[PDB]
């Protein structure tokens, strides 16, 4: 039977709340003995990489490599939704970043989305989604925003047409901020520029990621640490935050969420449905910033980034409550949902590597059900022309 195909259900928005930390934040100066729960997080890393490694045999030959990627395309239930959203509602730059940001705004109930700093942003899905949301949903009289990104990629001309808004610089001005957020001076400067050009900043987002599958979190630690530092250097009190992450298993990643827990009224690890359930992408969301860094906290963290190493930022043993809730996040998102969708894909591969139109025929009705549900859950209205962003490419 192909009844397993017939019984597929939509996924849900997965949202795991985290406890805010009462005690004063003490930025660690010395390596400390790891809490026992880190051994649990390391078990999660090994197993998730075990299921990820299952596709290794198919990658060796280019022939099966192509069938594998066809199969993975075939089982993406949202494939047609970008083009649909784009035509129906005059939405611009409707990449997958657009859907993910739009779903985040419709679900997380932010107090304000009106003064946006979007870092590591190009091609520009996040700013566009927020621009669409702010004009059709929130009706802010005018929406000011700044952005930055590592210099190229601008696919829609959002950078070239809005030089007022972008804080990165061209290689011509190699004198200088190229937008690389792994560089400490670039981070402090990026935050300085954003606060000068636009204040308060009510919403910070960062959507960066290197790629090439076992060290993806390890390889992205420095990029994300600066992603975080940029936002936490610029975000006004009462502001909100959205950071893209991956597997959340490294003790530095866990130490970093521990820092977050001191600065927002609420904190949630999320996986929106428009984020592919087969990958490890996650979104750390903080609502309502309680306080800014103290001058010492600025110095310590920026030095941390300047001479980087994977020692935890804090004493993890002081966050037993928070680490358990993070583990519940990994279990739900990674060990349960992601592993299930990888097994589903391999099963689809084994029964349909040679029957691609057939697998697409079965899932066609389910794809329409899923994409319609998304549109029902995150209501969209048409974006008036006078509020489109000025683009420089088609």
Swiss-Prot record:
For the protein in the UniProt heading, the enzyme class is transferase
Give GO BP annotations, semicolon-separated.
Answer: 7-methylguanosine mRNA capping; methylation
> Keywords assigned by UniProt?
Early protein, Methyltransferase, S-adenosyl-L-methionine, Transferase, Virion
**Which superkingdom?**
Viruses
Q: Which InterPro entries match?
A: Adrift-typ_MeTrfase, mRNA_Cap_2O-Ribose_MeTrfase, RNA_MeTrfase_FtsJ_dom, SAM-dependent_MTases_sf
Where is the protein situated, by its record's location annotation? Virion
Q: Tell me the Pfam families matching this sequence.
A: FtsJ (PF01728)
Please state the protein's primary subcellular location.
virion
Keyword Membrane applies: no
Official protein name in the record: Probable methyltransferase EP424R
What species was this sequence derived from? African swine fever virus (isolate Tick/South Africa/Pretoriuskop Pr4/1996)
Organism placement in taxonomy: Viruses, Varidnaviria, Bamfordvirae, Nucleocytoviricota, Pokkesviricetes
């Amino acid at each position: 039977r192909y009844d397993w195909l017939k019984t597929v259900e939509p996924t849900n928005f997965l949202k795991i709340g985290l406890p805010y930390q009462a005690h004063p934040l003490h930025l660690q100066h010395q390596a400390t003995t790891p809490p026992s729960i880190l051994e649990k997080f390391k078990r999660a890393d090994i197993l998730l990489n075990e299921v990820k490694a299952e596709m290794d045999p198919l990658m060796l030959q280019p022939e099966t490599e192509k069938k594998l990627f066809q199969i993975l395309s075939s089982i993406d239930m949202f494939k047609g939704l970008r083009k649909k959203v784009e035509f129906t509602y005059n939405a611009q730059i409707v990449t997958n970043a657009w859907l993910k940001m739009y779903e985040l705004l419709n679900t997380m109930n932010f107090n304000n989305t009106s003064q946006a700093f979007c870092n590591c942003e190009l091609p520009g899905g996040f700013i566009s989604a927020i621009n669409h949301f702010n004009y059709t949903m929130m009706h802010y009289p005018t929406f000011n925003w700044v952005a930055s990104s590592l210099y190229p990629e601008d696919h829609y001309g959002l950078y070239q047409c809005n030089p007022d808004n972008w804080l990165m610089q061209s290689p011509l001005l190699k004198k200088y901020n190229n937008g690389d957020v792994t560089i400490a001076s670039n981070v402090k400067n990026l935050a300085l520029r954003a606060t000068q050009r636009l204040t308060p900043i009510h919403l910070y987002t960062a959507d960066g990621g290197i790629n090439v599958y076992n060290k993806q979190e390890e390889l992205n630690l420095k990029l994300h640490f600066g992603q975080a530092l940029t936002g936490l250097l610029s975000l006004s009190k009462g502001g909100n935050m959205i950071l893209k992450h991956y597997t959340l298993n490294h003790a530095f990643t866990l130490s970093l969420i521990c820092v977050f827990s001191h600065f927002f009224e609420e904190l949630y690890i999320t996986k929106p449905t428009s984020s592919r359930p087969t990958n490890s992408e996650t979104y750390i969301v903080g609502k309502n910033r309680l306080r800014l860094f103290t001058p010492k906290e600025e110095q310590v963290l920026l030095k941390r980034l300047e001479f980087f190493n994977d020692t935890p930022l804090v004493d993890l043993s002081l966050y037993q409550n928070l680490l358990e809730s993070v583990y519940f996040a990994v279990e739900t998102i990674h060990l349960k949902q992601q592993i299930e969708f990888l097994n589903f894909g391999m099963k689809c591969y084994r029964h349909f590597y040679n029957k691609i139109k057939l697998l697409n025929d079965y899932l066609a009705p389910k794809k329409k059900i899923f994409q319609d549900r998304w549109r029902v859950l995150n209501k969209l209205y048409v974006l008036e022309k006078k509020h489109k962003l000025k683009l420089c490419a088609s």
